[PDB]
């Protein structure tokens, strides 16, 4: 079986490169962030612009939803994170404590914690309610490209330019696992699988790798795309067929069969690097977003 994603909408409005797109857990909304310092909210099914959320003093590299789709967290070059109430547009908290750009952020499944990674080579764990830093992990010796909680929040996965992927115990902060393969390419992305048993990692040698984190073993490899410079998100597509979805530096979206590693589809139409993709939680919908020469978001829909 192969998907048949087709372009349905193109969302313009960001005045600088788009950095990330995320669907809300309830599937109503798409949040996007940009180098233009803005978060934008769009309808997940029609693409109709909802609203703009502002307050960061410099560009935003990442944005992420809370479990109930009520809150966003944004990570910015102004070295802060911000917790936003989506409905009112208010900045509820400004998380200060990184000493360099913040690159990535996520909530835990409870959404009482936020995890952040920074150019200052640290991972930070913040309390959502008070906005105070709970833990500072000296995680890496280079900028941290991604951070992600597992399904129950007991585990944090982080990746860094230093070529390492590390697994941390959320409660204690000890390094439980370090993952690296035959070479040492910079790791540009990582995230847990929806069941929590695997982690998907991207390296800046045109490679996506599905890892069994307990055994410390690389289970699958996905190649054929172009990833050498940019921290490109990748996703597990589970609503239809089980796919691996990723942007690429040749301006295309790539879709692999998860088990066979075969490329099953390429999505064409962006005019710059596809830095970000997200998959809708109930419908076969992909959102993709591209860099400075393109500045748009595209929604694609398929039958499986």
């Amino acid at each position: 079986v192969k998907p048949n994603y087709a372009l349905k909408f193109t969302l313009a409005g960001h005045t600088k490169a788009v950095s990330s797109v995320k669907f809300s857990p309830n599937g109503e909304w798409l949040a996007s962030s940009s180098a233009d310092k803005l978060i934008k909210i769009w309808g997940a099914y029609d693409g109709k612009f909802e609203k703009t959320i502002s307050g960061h003093k410099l560009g935003i590299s990442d944005v992420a939803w809370s479990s109930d789709s009520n809150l966003l967290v944004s990570a910015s070059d102004d070295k802060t994170l911000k917790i936003w109430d989506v409905s009112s547009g208010k900045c509820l908290k400004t998380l200060k404590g990184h000493s360099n750009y913040v690159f990535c952020c996520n909530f835990n499944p409870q959404s009482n914690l936020i995890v952040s990674g920074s150019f200052d080579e640290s991972v930070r764990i913040w309390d959502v309610k008070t906005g105070k830093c709970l833990k500072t992990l000296p995680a890496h010796s280079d900028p941290v490209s991604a951070v992600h909680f597992n399904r129950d929040g007991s585990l944090i996965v982080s990746s860094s330019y230093d070529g390492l992927c590390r697994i941390w115990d959320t409660a204690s902060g000890q390094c439980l696992k370090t993952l690296i393969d035959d070479d040492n390419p910079p790791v540009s992305f990582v995230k847990f699988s929806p069941n929590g048993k695997y982690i998907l990692a991207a390296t800046l040698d045109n490679t996506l790798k599905l890892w069994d984190y307990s055994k410390g073993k690389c289970l699958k490899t996905y190649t054929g795309h172009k990833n050498e410079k940019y921290c490109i998100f990748a996703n597990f597509s589970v609503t239809g067929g089980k796919w691996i979805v990723s942007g690429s530096e040749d301006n295309l979206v790539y879709i692999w069969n998860l088990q066979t590693k075969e490329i099953v589809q390429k999505l064409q139409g962006h005019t710059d690097v596809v830095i970000s993709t997200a998959c809708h939680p109930t419908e076969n919908i992909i959102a993709s977003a591209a860099l400075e020469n393109d500045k748009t978001i595209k929604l694609w829909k398929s039958d499986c």
Binding site: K16, S33, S76, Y101, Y230, C231
Partner: peptide, 9 residues
Amino acid sequence: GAARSEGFS
């Protein structure tokens, strides 16, 4: 802008 949209050399 933003570090992600600038990339790594």
